[PDB]
Amino acid sequence: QSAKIKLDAPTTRTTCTNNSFKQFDASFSFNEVELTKVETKGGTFASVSIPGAFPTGEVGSPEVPAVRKLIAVPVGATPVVRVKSFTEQVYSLNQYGSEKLMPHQPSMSKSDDPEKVPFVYNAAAYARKGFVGQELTQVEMLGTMRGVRIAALTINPVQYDVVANQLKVRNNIEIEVSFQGA
Amino acid sequence: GSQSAKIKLDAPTTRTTCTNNSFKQFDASFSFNEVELTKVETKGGTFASVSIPGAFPTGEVGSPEVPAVRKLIAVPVGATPVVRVKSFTEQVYSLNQYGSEKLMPHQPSMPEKVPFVYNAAAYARKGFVGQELTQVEMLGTMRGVRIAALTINPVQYDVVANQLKVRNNIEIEVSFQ
């Protein structure tokens, strides 16, 4: 079972338009978020995701979905993202259930019994008022693999107000990626 | 001879789209508005060089260079990416009207470290020569992320006829495991 919450875009689509050799435009749109109820050692929580996204957040704090795009970086270039535009809307989650977003759990240690792993829940973070989230865009050089320099372009469309149980979703995100060199 | 000849392709813009339906599957589309043809002076004579915006040169070393597009994708744990071609458009473009020079041969790497490589047998091959339209290669893992390279090969070349066969508006489905 899952609740589908419709967002202000007709489709979940990512586009890249190559406008020159050292520049491209990209656009990210999301038609919905999927909210699933998850049973845990700390209670029932909600888990919100977007198609092709991965969960992010500090260990013990509410998990939110982010999208990652991998790009090839030319030799001697630095990728620089410029945000052109986006839309933004708030979505109240209490109407679907009073459960808060699930807390982000630590990575699993291979030799551990999953049943005996202590559940991490930062009560102080769950009592903090106002919207919490990452910068909309991030660029990180990951390294070189088989002669290809790879960067990770991360898009963080979701902010969350745990006390109000509200999502703030940025959508129709238009960016320009420039490969700065000299 | 820096300014390229712009050959109009059968798509209004150079654009890549990814329509993410599920966590196990996404659709992608690749389109190209034009090919750029430049004349290049080399150790082995003057040759033509064809490119597409956002593409990189490919081909066997010593054989005609053709542009390909590479998309890097994150692969879920335990999954194998599998590509299915849904559709594409195709058109042939005669290059002799721009010049009789053939496409330049693909060089190994790159001042004088790398000698000039020219496979005369590759330049006598009749008919269209090129790679499969799509290829998937696991590159490895970097900072907890499994990375695959999805290569799209829109160009085939008939060196004797000096003609390009360009596949465009390429629609694919990528499924994980």
PDB file of N, CA, C and O in Angstrom, chain A residues 11-21 51-53 68-72 140-146 148-151, chain B residues 13-23 33 53-54 70-74 137-143 145-148:
ATOM      1  N   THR A  11       4.436  15.307 -15.410  1.00  0.00           N
ATOM      2  CA  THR A  11       5.185  14.046 -15.467  1.00  0.00           C
ATOM      3  C   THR A  11       6.462  14.082 -14.673  1.00  0.00           C
ATOM      4  O   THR A  11       6.999  15.158 -14.438  1.00  0.00           O
ATOM      5  N   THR A  12       6.974  12.909 -14.289  1.00  0.00           N
ATOM      6  CA  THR A  12       8.278  12.799 -13.655  1.00  0.00           C
ATOM      7  C   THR A  12       9.248  12.610 -14.809  1.00  0.00           C
ATOM      8  O   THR A  12       9.246  11.561 -15.461  1.00  0.00           O
ATOM      9  N   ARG A  13      10.008  13.651 -15.108  1.00  0.00           N
ATOM     10  CA  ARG A  13      10.908  13.642 -16.248  1.00  0.00           C
ATOM     11  C   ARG A  13      12.131  14.492 -15.960  1.00  0.00           C
ATOM     12  O   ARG A  13      12.044  15.505 -15.256  1.00  0.00           O
ATOM     13  N   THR A  14      13.276  14.044 -16.477  1.00  0.00           N
ATOM     14  CA  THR A  14      14.523  14.783 -16.397  1.00  0.00           C
ATOM     15  C   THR A  14      14.939  15.021 -17.822  1.00  0.00           C
ATOM     16  O   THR A  14      14.884  14.075 -18.623  1.00  0.00           O
ATOM     17  N   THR A  15      15.343  16.267 -18.166  1.00  0.00           N
ATOM     18  CA  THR A  15      15.826  16.528 -19.517  1.00  0.00           C
ATOM     19  C   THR A  15      17.183  17.197 -19.482  1.00  0.00           C
ATOM     20  O   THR A  15      17.480  17.931 -18.539  1.00  0.00           O
ATOM     21  N   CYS A  16      17.989  16.951 -20.504  1.00  0.00           N
ATOM     22  CA  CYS A  16      19.291  17.597 -20.665  1.00  0.00           C
ATOM     23  C   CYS A  16      19.373  18.082 -22.077  1.00  0.00           C
ATOM     24  O   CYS A  16      19.185  17.295 -23.020  1.00  0.00           O
ATOM     25  N   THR A  17      19.610  19.385 -22.240  1.00  0.00           N
ATOM     26  CA  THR A  17      19.720  19.979 -23.561  1.00  0.00           C
ATOM     27  C   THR A  17      21.157  20.501 -23.704  1.00  0.00           C
ATOM     28  O   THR A  17      21.602  21.336 -22.906  1.00  0.00           O
ATOM     29  N   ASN A  18      21.905  19.921 -24.658  1.00  0.00           N
ATOM     30  CA  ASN A  18      23.292  20.323 -24.929  1.00  0.00           C
ATOM     31  C   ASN A  18      23.255  21.516 -25.826  1.00  0.00           C
ATOM     32  O   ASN A  18      22.996  21.383 -27.035  1.00  0.00           O
ATOM     33  N   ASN A  19      23.484  22.695 -25.221  1.00  0.00           N
ATOM     34  CA  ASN A  19      23.455  23.985 -25.910  1.00  0.00           C
ATOM     35  C   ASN A  19      24.852  24.435 -26.429  1.00  0.00           C
ATOM     36  O   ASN A  19      24.897  25.265 -27.336  1.00  0.00           O
ATOM     37  N   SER A  20      25.967  23.858 -25.894  1.00  0.00           N
ATOM     38  CA  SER A  20      27.362  24.072 -26.341  1.00  0.00           C
ATOM     39  C   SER A  20      28.263  22.922 -25.816  1.00  0.00           C
ATOM     40  O   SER A  20      27.775  22.062 -25.077  1.00  0.00           O
ATOM     41  N   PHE A  21      29.560  22.903 -26.205  1.00  0.00           N
ATOM     42  CA  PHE A  21      30.505  21.853 -25.786  1.00  0.00           C
ATOM     43  C   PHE A  21      30.845  21.934 -24.274  1.00  0.00           C
ATOM     44  O   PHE A  21      31.094  20.892 -23.656  1.00  0.00           O
ATOM     45  N   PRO A  51      10.159   8.663  -7.802  1.00  0.00           N
ATOM     46  CA  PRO A  51      10.741   7.611  -8.650  1.00  0.00           C
ATOM     47  C   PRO A  51      12.184   7.942  -9.011  1.00  0.00           C
ATOM     48  O   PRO A  51      12.472   9.072  -9.411  1.00  0.00           O
ATOM     49  N   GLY A  52      13.070   6.985  -8.753  1.00  0.00           N
ATOM     50  CA  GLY A  52      14.499   7.102  -9.032  1.00  0.00           C
ATOM     51  C   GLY A  52      15.298   7.884  -8.008  1.00  0.00           C
ATOM     52  O   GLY A  52      16.441   8.253  -8.274  1.00  0.00           O
ATOM     53  N   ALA A  53      14.697   8.170  -6.838  1.00  0.00           N
ATOM     54  CA  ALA A  53      15.371   8.922  -5.780  1.00  0.00           C
ATOM     55  C   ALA A  53      15.935   7.982  -4.733  1.00  0.00           C
ATOM     56  O   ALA A  53      15.604   6.796  -4.734  1.00  0.00           O
ATOM     57  N   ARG A  68      20.048  11.957  -7.826  1.00  0.00           N
ATOM     58  CA  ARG A  68      21.460  12.105  -8.208  1.00  0.00           C
ATOM     59  C   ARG A  68      21.642  11.819  -9.696  1.00  0.00           C
ATOM     60  O   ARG A  68      21.166  10.792 -10.196  1.00  0.00           O
ATOM     61  N   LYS A  69      22.320  12.731 -10.401  1.00  0.00           N
ATOM     62  CA  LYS A  69      22.668  12.573 -11.810  1.00  0.00           C
ATOM     63  C   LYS A  69      24.190  12.538 -11.952  1.00  0.00           C
ATOM     64  O   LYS A  69      24.876  13.401 -11.406  1.00  0.00           O
ATOM     65  N   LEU A  70      24.713  11.528 -12.657  1.00  0.00           N
ATOM     66  CA  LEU A  70      26.153  11.415 -12.862  1.00  0.00           C
ATOM     67  C   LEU A  70      26.496  12.010 -14.195  1.00  0.00           C
ATOM     68  O   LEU A  70      25.783  11.759 -15.178  1.00  0.00           O
ATOM     69  N   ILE A  71      27.558  12.834 -14.234  1.00  0.00           N
ATOM     70  CA  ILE A  71      27.974  13.517 -15.454  1.00  0.00           C
ATOM     71  C   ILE A  71      29.470  13.365 -15.685  1.00  0.00           C
ATOM     72  O   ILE A  71      30.255  13.344 -14.731  1.00  0.00           O
ATOM     73  N   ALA A  72      29.855  13.292 -16.957  1.00  0.00           N
ATOM     74  CA  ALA A  72      31.255  13.230 -17.365  1.00  0.00           C
ATOM     75  C   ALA A  72      31.789  14.655 -17.400  1.00  0.00           C
ATOM     76  O   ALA A  72      31.125  15.540 -17.950  1.00  0.00           O
ATOM     77  N   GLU A 140      29.619  17.498  -6.789  1.00  0.00           N
ATOM     78  CA  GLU A 140      30.754  16.859  -6.128  1.00  0.00           C
ATOM     79  C   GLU A 140      31.538  16.019  -7.136  1.00  0.00           C
ATOM     80  O   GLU A 140      30.947  15.195  -7.833  1.00  0.00           O
ATOM     81  N   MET A 141      32.854  16.235  -7.215  1.00  0.00           N
ATOM     82  CA  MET A 141      33.735  15.427  -8.068  1.00  0.00           C
ATOM     83  C   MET A 141      33.910  14.087  -7.372  1.00  0.00           C
ATOM     84  O   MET A 141      34.259  14.068  -6.187  1.00  0.00           O
ATOM     85  N   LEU A 142      33.558  12.979  -8.048  1.00  0.00           N
ATOM     86  CA  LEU A 142      33.635  11.656  -7.427  1.00  0.00           C
ATOM     87  C   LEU A 142      34.992  10.985  -7.652  1.00  0.00           C
ATOM     88  O   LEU A 142      35.394  10.134  -6.859  1.00  0.00           O
ATOM     89  N   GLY A 143      35.643  11.339  -8.750  1.00  0.00           N
ATOM     90  CA  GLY A 143      36.916  10.764  -9.155  1.00  0.00           C
ATOM     91  C   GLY A 143      36.921  10.393 -10.621  1.00  0.00           C
ATOM     92  O   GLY A 143      36.041  10.818 -11.383  1.00  0.00           O
ATOM     93  N   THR A 144      37.927   9.604 -11.022  1.00  0.00           N
ATOM     94  CA  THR A 144      38.114   9.162 -12.397  1.00  0.00           C
ATOM     95  C   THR A 144      37.998   7.631 -12.469  1.00  0.00           C
ATOM     96  O   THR A 144      38.552   6.919 -11.631  1.00  0.00           O
ATOM     97  N   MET A 145      37.239   7.151 -13.464  1.00  0.00           N
ATOM     98  CA  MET A 145      37.013   5.736 -13.731  1.00  0.00           C
ATOM     99  C   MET A 145      37.093   5.478 -15.223  1.00  0.00           C
ATOM    100  O   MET A 145      36.291   6.024 -15.994  1.00  0.00           O
ATOM    101  N   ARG A 146      38.088   4.664 -15.629  1.00  0.00           N
ATOM    102  CA  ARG A 146      38.352   4.255 -17.011  1.00  0.00           C
ATOM    103  C   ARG A 146      38.478   5.484 -17.943  1.00  0.00           C
ATOM    104  O   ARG A 146      37.807   5.564 -18.980  1.00  0.00           O
ATOM    105  N   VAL A 148      37.493   8.510 -17.444  1.00  0.00           N
ATOM    106  CA  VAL A 148      36.340   9.421 -17.396  1.00  0.00           C
ATOM    107  C   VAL A 148      36.234  10.077 -16.010  1.00  0.00           C
ATOM    108  O   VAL A 148      36.025   9.376 -15.019  1.00  0.00           O
ATOM    109  N   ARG A 149      36.360  11.417 -15.946  1.00  0.00           N
ATOM    110  CA  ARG A 149      36.156  12.181 -14.706  1.00  0.00           C
ATOM    111  C   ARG A 149      34.665  12.253 -14.469  1.00  0.00           C
ATOM    112  O   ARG A 149      33.925  12.661 -15.367  1.00  0.00           O
ATOM    113  N   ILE A 150      34.211  11.838 -13.281  1.00  0.00           N
ATOM    114  CA  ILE A 150      32.790  11.781 -12.981  1.00  0.00           C
ATOM    115  C   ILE A 150      32.432  12.725 -11.844  1.00  0.00           C
ATOM    116  O   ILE A 150      33.075  12.726 -10.799  1.00  0.00           O
ATOM    117  N   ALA A 151      31.362  13.489 -12.046  1.00  0.00           N
ATOM    118  CA  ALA A 151      30.806  14.328 -11.001  1.00  0.00           C
ATOM    119  C   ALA A 151      29.390  13.868 -10.688  1.00  0.00           C
ATOM    120  O   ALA A 151      28.710  13.301 -11.557  1.00  0.00           O
TER     121      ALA A 151
ATOM    122  N   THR B  13      15.864  19.668 -31.721  1.00  0.00           N
ATOM    123  CA  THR B  13      16.856  20.015 -30.697  1.00  0.00           C
ATOM    124  C   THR B  13      17.709  18.847 -30.280  1.00  0.00           C
ATOM    125  O   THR B  13      17.285  17.695 -30.413  1.00  0.00           O
ATOM    126  N   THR B  14      18.901  19.139 -29.722  1.00  0.00           N
ATOM    127  CA  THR B  14      19.747  18.109 -29.136  1.00  0.00           C
ATOM    128  C   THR B  14      19.301  18.003 -27.679  1.00  0.00           C
ATOM    129  O   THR B  14      19.523  18.912 -26.883  1.00  0.00           O
ATOM    130  N   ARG B  15      18.633  16.906 -27.355  1.00  0.00           N
ATOM    131  CA  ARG B  15      18.035  16.734 -26.051  1.00  0.00           C
ATOM    132  C   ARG B  15      18.051  15.269 -25.639  1.00  0.00           C
ATOM    133  O   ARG B  15      17.886  14.383 -26.478  1.00  0.00           O
ATOM    134  N   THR B  16      18.252  15.023 -24.349  1.00  0.00           N
ATOM    135  CA  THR B  16      18.175  13.695 -23.761  1.00  0.00           C
ATOM    136  C   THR B  16      17.097  13.779 -22.711  1.00  0.00           C
ATOM    137  O   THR B  16      17.070  14.755 -21.950  1.00  0.00           O
ATOM    138  N   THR B  17      16.185  12.784 -22.666  1.00  0.00           N
ATOM    139  CA  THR B  17      15.178  12.788 -21.605  1.00  0.00           C
ATOM    140  C   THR B  17      15.164  11.451 -20.886  1.00  0.00           C
ATOM    141  O   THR B  17      15.471  10.418 -21.494  1.00  0.00           O
ATOM    142  N   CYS B  18      14.813  11.465 -19.611  1.00  0.00           N
ATOM    143  CA  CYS B  18      14.665  10.255 -18.814  1.00  0.00           C
ATOM    144  C   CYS B  18      13.350  10.374 -18.101  1.00  0.00           C
ATOM    145  O   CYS B  18      13.097  11.370 -17.408  1.00  0.00           O
ATOM    146  N   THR B  19      12.465   9.432 -18.369  1.00  0.00           N
ATOM    147  CA  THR B  19      11.143   9.420 -17.772  1.00  0.00           C
ATOM    148  C   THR B  19      11.182   8.223 -16.828  1.00  0.00           C
ATOM    149  O   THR B  19      11.231   7.070 -17.289  1.00  0.00           O
ATOM    150  N   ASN B  20      11.335   8.521 -15.518  1.00  0.00           N
ATOM    151  CA  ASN B  20      11.489   7.511 -14.474  1.00  0.00           C
ATOM    152  C   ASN B  20      10.124   7.059 -13.980  1.00  0.00           C
ATOM    153  O   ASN B  20       9.454   7.760 -13.210  1.00  0.00           O
ATOM    154  N   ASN B  21       9.699   5.891 -14.482  1.00  0.00           N
ATOM    155  CA  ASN B  21       8.401   5.307 -14.167  1.00  0.00           C
ATOM    156  C   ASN B  21       8.456   4.562 -12.814  1.00  0.00           C
ATOM    157  O   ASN B  21       7.707   4.909 -11.894  1.00  0.00           O
ATOM    158  N   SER B  22       9.368   3.569 -12.692  1.00  0.00           N
ATOM    159  CA  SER B  22       9.568   2.745 -11.492  1.00  0.00           C
ATOM    160  C   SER B  22      11.009   2.865 -10.963  1.00  0.00           C
ATOM    161  O   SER B  22      11.814   3.604 -11.530  1.00  0.00           O
ATOM    162  N   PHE B  23      11.328   2.149  -9.868  1.00  0.00           N
ATOM    163  CA  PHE B  23      12.675   2.133  -9.290  1.00  0.00           C
ATOM    164  C   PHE B  23      13.536   1.094 -10.024  1.00  0.00           C
ATOM    165  O   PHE B  23      14.768   1.172  -9.997  1.00  0.00           O
ATOM    166  N   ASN B  33      20.009  17.609 -33.186  1.00  0.00           N
ATOM    167  CA  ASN B  33      19.476  18.529 -34.202  1.00  0.00           C
ATOM    168  C   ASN B  33      20.360  18.630 -35.445  1.00  0.00           C
ATOM    169  O   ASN B  33      19.870  18.994 -36.511  1.00  0.00           O
ATOM    170  N   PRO B  53      26.652  17.640 -30.752  1.00  0.00           N
ATOM    171  CA  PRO B  53      26.858  18.311 -29.455  1.00  0.00           C
ATOM    172  C   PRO B  53      26.660  17.335 -28.294  1.00  0.00           C
ATOM    173  O   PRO B  53      25.715  16.541 -28.283  1.00  0.00           O
ATOM    174  N   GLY B  54      27.635  17.328 -27.406  1.00  0.00           N
ATOM    175  CA  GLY B  54      27.661  16.467 -26.229  1.00  0.00           C
ATOM    176  C   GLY B  54      28.156  15.055 -26.475  1.00  0.00           C
ATOM    177  O   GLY B  54      28.051  14.204 -25.588  1.00  0.00           O
ATOM    178  N   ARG B  70      27.505   9.083 -24.331  1.00  0.00           N
ATOM    179  CA  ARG B  70      27.633   8.246 -23.138  1.00  0.00           C
ATOM    180  C   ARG B  70      26.868   8.866 -21.995  1.00  0.00           C
ATOM    181  O   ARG B  70      27.081  10.047 -21.669  1.00  0.00           O
ATOM    182  N   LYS B  71      25.987   8.070 -21.391  1.00  0.00           N
ATOM    183  CA  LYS B  71      25.215   8.471 -20.224  1.00  0.00           C
ATOM    184  C   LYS B  71      25.649   7.616 -19.037  1.00  0.00           C
ATOM    185  O   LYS B  71      25.703   6.378 -19.149  1.00  0.00           O
ATOM    186  N   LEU B  72      25.987   8.270 -17.915  1.00  0.00           N
ATOM    187  CA  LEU B  72      26.402   7.542 -16.715  1.00  0.00           C
ATOM    188  C   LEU B  72      25.205   7.378 -15.822  1.00  0.00           C
ATOM    189  O   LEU B  72      24.449   8.331 -15.639  1.00  0.00           O
ATOM    190  N   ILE B  73      24.985   6.156 -15.330  1.00  0.00           N
ATOM    191  CA  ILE B  73      23.831   5.852 -14.498  1.00  0.00           C
ATOM    192  C   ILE B  73      24.253   5.101 -13.250  1.00  0.00           C
ATOM    193  O   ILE B  73      25.184   4.292 -13.281  1.00  0.00           O
ATOM    194  N   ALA B  74      23.535   5.358 -12.158  1.00  0.00           N
ATOM    195  CA  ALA B  74      23.725   4.662 -10.896  1.00  0.00           C
ATOM    196  C   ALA B  74      22.958   3.347 -10.979  1.00  0.00           C
ATOM    197  O   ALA B  74      21.794   3.337 -11.406  1.00  0.00           O
ATOM    198  N   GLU B 137      27.980  -0.978 -20.061  1.00  0.00           N
ATOM    199  CA  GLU B 137      29.230  -1.440 -19.452  1.00  0.00           C
ATOM    200  C   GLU B 137      29.291  -1.011 -17.987  1.00  0.00           C
ATOM    201  O   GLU B 137      29.114   0.168 -17.688  1.00  0.00           O
ATOM    202  N   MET B 138      29.528  -1.963 -17.078  1.00  0.00           N
ATOM    203  CA  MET B 138      29.687  -1.654 -15.654  1.00  0.00           C
ATOM    204  C   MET B 138      31.080  -1.063 -15.505  1.00  0.00           C
ATOM    205  O   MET B 138      32.041  -1.661 -15.998  1.00  0.00           O
ATOM    206  N   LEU B 139      31.184   0.159 -14.960  1.00  0.00           N
ATOM    207  CA  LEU B 139      32.481   0.832 -14.842  1.00  0.00           C
ATOM    208  C   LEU B 139      33.180   0.528 -13.520  1.00  0.00           C
ATOM    209  O   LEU B 139      34.408   0.560 -13.451  1.00  0.00           O
ATOM    210  N   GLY B 140      32.388   0.258 -12.492  1.00  0.00           N
ATOM    211  CA  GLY B 140      32.864  -0.014 -11.145  1.00  0.00           C
ATOM    212  C   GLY B 140      32.070   0.750 -10.112  1.00  0.00           C
ATOM    213  O   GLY B 140      30.986   1.266 -10.409  1.00  0.00           O
ATOM    214  N   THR B 141      32.603   0.821  -8.893  1.00  0.00           N
ATOM    215  CA  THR B 141      31.979   1.496  -7.759  1.00  0.00           C
ATOM    216  C   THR B 141      32.860   2.665  -7.297  1.00  0.00           C
ATOM    217  O   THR B 141      34.083   2.534  -7.208  1.00  0.00           O
ATOM    218  N   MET B 142      32.229   3.824  -7.064  1.00  0.00           N
ATOM    219  CA  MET B 142      32.874   5.050  -6.604  1.00  0.00           C
ATOM    220  C   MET B 142      32.018   5.719  -5.547  1.00  0.00           C
ATOM    221  O   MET B 142      30.884   6.108  -5.828  1.00  0.00           O
ATOM    222  N   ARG B 143      32.565   5.833  -4.326  1.00  0.00           N
ATOM    223  CA  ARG B 143      31.937   6.446  -3.151  1.00  0.00           C
ATOM    224  C   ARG B 143      30.542   5.828  -2.873  1.00  0.00           C
ATOM    225  O   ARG B 143      29.553   6.549  -2.719  1.00  0.00           O
ATOM    226  N   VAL B 145      28.650   4.154  -4.881  1.00  0.00           N
ATOM    227  CA  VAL B 145      27.741   4.205  -6.034  1.00  0.00           C
ATOM    228  C   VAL B 145      28.257   3.314  -7.169  1.00  0.00           C
ATOM    229  O   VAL B 145      29.336   3.586  -7.700  1.00  0.00           O
ATOM    230  N   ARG B 146      27.483   2.272  -7.556  1.00  0.00           N
ATOM    231  CA  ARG B 146      27.808   1.420  -8.719  1.00  0.00           C
ATOM    232  C   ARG B 146      27.468   2.210  -9.960  1.00  0.00           C
ATOM    233  O   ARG B 146      26.343   2.705 -10.078  1.00  0.00           O
ATOM    234  N   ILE B 147      28.428   2.359 -10.872  1.00  0.00           N
ATOM    235  CA  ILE B 147      28.221   3.176 -12.052  1.00  0.00           C
ATOM    236  C   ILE B 147      28.300   2.340 -13.321  1.00  0.00           C
ATOM    237  O   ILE B 147      29.238   1.565 -13.510  1.00  0.00           O
ATOM    238  N   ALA B 148      27.333   2.552 -14.213  1.00  0.00           N
ATOM    239  CA  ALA B 148      27.355   1.954 -15.533  1.00  0.00           C
ATOM    240  C   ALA B 148      27.411   3.044 -16.570  1.00  0.00           C
ATOM    241  O   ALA B 148      26.942   4.162 -16.324  1.00  0.00           O
TER     242      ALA B 148
END
